[PDB]
Amino acid sequence: YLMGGAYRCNYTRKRFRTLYHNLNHFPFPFHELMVWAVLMKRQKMALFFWQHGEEAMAKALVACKLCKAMAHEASENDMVDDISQELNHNSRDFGQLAVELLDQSYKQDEQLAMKLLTYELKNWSNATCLQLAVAAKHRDFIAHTCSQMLLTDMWMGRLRMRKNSGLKVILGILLPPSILSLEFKNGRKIYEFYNAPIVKFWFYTLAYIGYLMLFNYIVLVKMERWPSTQEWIVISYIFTLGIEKMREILMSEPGKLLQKVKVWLQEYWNVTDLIAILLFSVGMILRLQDQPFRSDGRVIYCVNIIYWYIRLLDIFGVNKYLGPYVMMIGKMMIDMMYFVIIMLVVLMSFGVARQAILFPNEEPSWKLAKNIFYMPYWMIYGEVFADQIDPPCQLPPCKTGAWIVPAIMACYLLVANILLVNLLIAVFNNTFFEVKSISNQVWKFQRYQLIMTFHERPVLPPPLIIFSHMTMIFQHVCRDYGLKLFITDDELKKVHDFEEQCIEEYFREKDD
Amino acid sequence: SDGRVIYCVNIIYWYIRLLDIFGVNKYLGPYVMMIGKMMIDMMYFVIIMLVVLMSFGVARQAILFPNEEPSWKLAKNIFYMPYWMIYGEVFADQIDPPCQLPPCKTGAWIVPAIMACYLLVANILLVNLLIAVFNNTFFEVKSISNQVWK
Numbered sequence A: 001y002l003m004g005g006a007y008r009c010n011y012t013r014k015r016f017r018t019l020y021h022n023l024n025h026f027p028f029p030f031h032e033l034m035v036w037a038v039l040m041k042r043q044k045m046a047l048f049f050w051q052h053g054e055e056a057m058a059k060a061l062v063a064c065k066l067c068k069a070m071a072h073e074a075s076e077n078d079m080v081d082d083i084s085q086e087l088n089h090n091s092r093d094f095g096q097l098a099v100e101l102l103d104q105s106y107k108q109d110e111q112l113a114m115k116l117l118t119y120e121l122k123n124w125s126n127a128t129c130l131q132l133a134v135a136a137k138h139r140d141f142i143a144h145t146c147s148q149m150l151l152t153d154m155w156m157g158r159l160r161m162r163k164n165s166g167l168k169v170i171l172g173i174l175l176p177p178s179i180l181s182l183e184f185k186n187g188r189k190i191y192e193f194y195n196a197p198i199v200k201f202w203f204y205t206l207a208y209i210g211y212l213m214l215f216n217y218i219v220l221v222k223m224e225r226w227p228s229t230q231e232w233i234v235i236s237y238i239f240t241l242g243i244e245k246m247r248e249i250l251m252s253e254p255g256k257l258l259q260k261v262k263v264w265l266q267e268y269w270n271v272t273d274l275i276a277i278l279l280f281s282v283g284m285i286l287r288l289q290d291q292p293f294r295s296d297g298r299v300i301y302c303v304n305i306i307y308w309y310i311r312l313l314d315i316f317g318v319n320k321y322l323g324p325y326v327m328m329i330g331k332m333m334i335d336m337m338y339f340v341i342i343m344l345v346v347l348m349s350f351g352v353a354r355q356a357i358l359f360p361n362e363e364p365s366w367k368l369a370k371n372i373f374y375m376p377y378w379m380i381y382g383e384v385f386a387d388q389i390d391p392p393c394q395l396p397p398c399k400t401g402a403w404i405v406p407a408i409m410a411c412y413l414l415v416a417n418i419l420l421v422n423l424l425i426a427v428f429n430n431t432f433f434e435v436k437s438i439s440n441q442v443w444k445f446q447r448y449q450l451i452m453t454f455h456e457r458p459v460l461p462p463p464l465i466i467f468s469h470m471t472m473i474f475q476h477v478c479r480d481y482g483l484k485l486f487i488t489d490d491e492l493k494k495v496h497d498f499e500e501q502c503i504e505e506y507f508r509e510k511d512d
Numbered sequence B: 001s002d003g004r005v006i007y008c009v010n011i012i013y014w015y016i017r018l019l020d021i022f023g024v025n026k027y028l029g030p031y032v033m034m035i036g037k038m039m040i041d042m043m044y045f046v047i048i049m050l051v052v053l054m055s056f057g058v059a060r061q062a063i064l065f066p067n068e069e070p071s072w073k074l075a076k077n078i079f080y081m082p083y084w085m086i087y088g089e090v091f092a093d094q095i096d097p098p099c100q101l102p103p104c105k106t107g108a109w110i111v112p113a114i115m116a117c118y119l120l121v122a123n124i125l126l127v128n129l130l131i132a133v134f135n136n137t138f139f140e141v142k143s144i145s146n147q148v149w150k
């Protein structure tokens, strides 16, 4: 219950249940001893038990996750609020121990360090160290150099092209004969090329670019009574994308259909995609009707194309420099919202004053609510036309107190364009280093999720993914790498010896 | 006439090449190299602004004119007016015209709202973030430029 949905402790297995039914020993006693010390808030005992035995990094990550879960449970049940602080401190200590051990292992030997993070852990419900670190939301562990290089190796697949990627992958996708010219890591070459995560990502990117081109074409030119070929291709793309989203919902982690909906709705992109697909379905339904409903469907298409243009930032978030910038944009959006509230108050004040002064004989109409916001808002973006505001009133009679409007305009412009915008620039300037560092760490953490979700995806892009969906139905009646790495007993022994050497060297260096 | 036009483009280049001569002054060389690096940063932010601009332009062109034959003038109206709009030319009669009066197009009230959102994003968020980026990465660039010039 504390670890997660997919975790399976050895105590609840059928073999241990049968052994405990008629009541031996434990192969690794320090695992159970450290779990006991962690569950009972004995930090010194847990730290003593951590450095004895094998799988030190796995024990550190498991202890960090357990302490975090216990802190959350204690804070939920209104404890003394000092237990929660102690548990959070314990979790931070164990996370720091894991990070320092990883740093020592990577500094000593690199290949064995990578082998440490991917080999399957039989004692911990068959989960690698990367999965334990991700399940603990440990951002400083995934953002380490060794974890990043391992993720790059997983992302590149079975290819060794490391000089200039992307262009060669694009050439291979566009020229299938050009595939048999790339070096591979130690017929089947095509299967290894089309199953790498990077090739799947570029296939999806090219399909999305073509879909955007077709959407622009169908909205720009005149729409006839019945959909043209490009409109049918766009509708097919939307339908297959919706089917793929439903398939991803179905194969989530929880065992209930209603519970998987919440977990899938955790991310904002999924919610926005669902809303956009529903809106496109409504617009397509309204499009196949008479003329006014056809126009309404066309307008819905235009709004939807705004969203699908905006969604290119998700694709851009794979570049090393275009992901942190997008997350910085997100946080600066919150700050800009606060300052927009104040500017809106000032703008409403000026607009109401000018509208009331200049036009004193207006009947109640909804056009009054438009003149308040429209002109003062366009005024602060350079459209400061001084004949439309305070007109020179042969000449028409001057309204009573119409000389106040230019003075109020001067004060409003001085406040809006010299004070608030400069203060906003200062706010963005003095809170940039922290936001930049946080964005870098979060992007390096989410690289793992990107790689995993493109490793689990099918090969064909959504325009022609309907073939891959039918094969799953046909195979319904019937991880060597990418997730784990299975090794023999000699390799396991060598890994254990290397880890013990690393931890004893780390403690010796710390003491010295 | 074609040769004359090529001459005009070439004169642009030969005017730009005065920075090579300016790079002998003690204070006008480091500034040019700083300009070079800030050009790379400005390229990154130009990509994002271009995405936003294309979205708004396509939306406005599709909403306002629904009976246009396929022509290369469509590809011009997307980039032209939204690009000149963010440099102070925010003429509100050319965009969302007041439609004696001609009939109002279906859903033509969305264009000013989209314009407001687009202006707020382009002129308050991205440019201020670019100013912050230039501001917080100036000391290192300045020192590197001084060393490289020397």
Ligand SMILES: CCCCCCCC(=O)OC[C@H](COP(=O)(O)O[C@@H]1[C@H](O)[C@H](O)[C@@H](OP(=O)(O)O)[C@H](OP(=O)(O)O)[C@H]1O)OC(=O)CCCCCCC
Pocket (backbone or CB within 6 Å): A164, A165, A166, A167, A205, A209, A315, A316, A317, A318, A319, A320
């Ligand atoms: C339509 C596309 C829109 C979505 C764009 C999709 C998002 C996107 O832009 O891709 C990112 C990727 C760039 O990364 P890519 O692997 O190709 O190359 C990186 C680049 O060469 C850096 O200079 C390297 O060192 P550093 O960082 O300076 O230290 C870095 O090495 P490392 O540190 O990793 O070991 C390299 O990774 O691909 C391209 O843009 C190449 C042209 C292909 C795209 C151009 C053709 C379209």
Ligand SMILES: COCC(CCO[C@H]1CC[C@@]2(C)C(=CC[C@H]3[C@@H]4C[C@@H]5O[C@]6(CC[C@@H](C)CO6)[C@@H](C)[C@@H]5[C@@]4(C)CC[C@@H]32)C1)COC
Pocket (backbone or CB within 6 Å): A364, A365, A366, A367, A368, A369
């Ligand atoms: C074309 O003819 C229209 C007619 C119906 C006319 O009804 C009128 C009823 C009052 C109403 C809704 C109208 C115009 C100004 C409207 C104000 C604008 C204000 O703005 C807000 C702005 C921001 C707020 C903070 C302050 O108030 C409103 C509370 C305020 C506001 C909405 C009060 C309501 C006013 C229209 C049709 O019927 C046959």
Ligand SMILES: COCC(CCO[C@H]1CC[C@@]2(C)C(=CC[C@H]3[C@@H]4C[C@@H]5O[C@]6(CC[C@@H](C)CO6)[C@@H](C)[C@@H]5[C@@]4(C)CC[C@@H]32)C1)COC
Pocket (backbone or CB within 6 Å): A212, A213, A214, A216, A217, A220, B070, B071, B072, B073, B074, B075
């Ligand atoms: C004067 O008459 C011209 C006529 C030839 C007309 O051909 C038309 C063919 C479609 C084409 C090339 C035309 C106008 C809009 C064009 C779109 C603009 C889009 O912009 C881009 C913008 C940015 C992209 C991201 C999205 O798409 C295009 C993929 C898109 C684009 C280039 C698709 C192609 C469209 C012209 C002459 O023949 C006798």
Ligand code: NA
Pocket (backbone or CB within 6 Å): A381, A382, B087, B088
């Ligand atoms: Na201006």
Ligand code: NA
Pocket (backbone or CB within 6 Å): A382, A383, A384, B088, B089, B090
């Ligand atoms: Na102007």
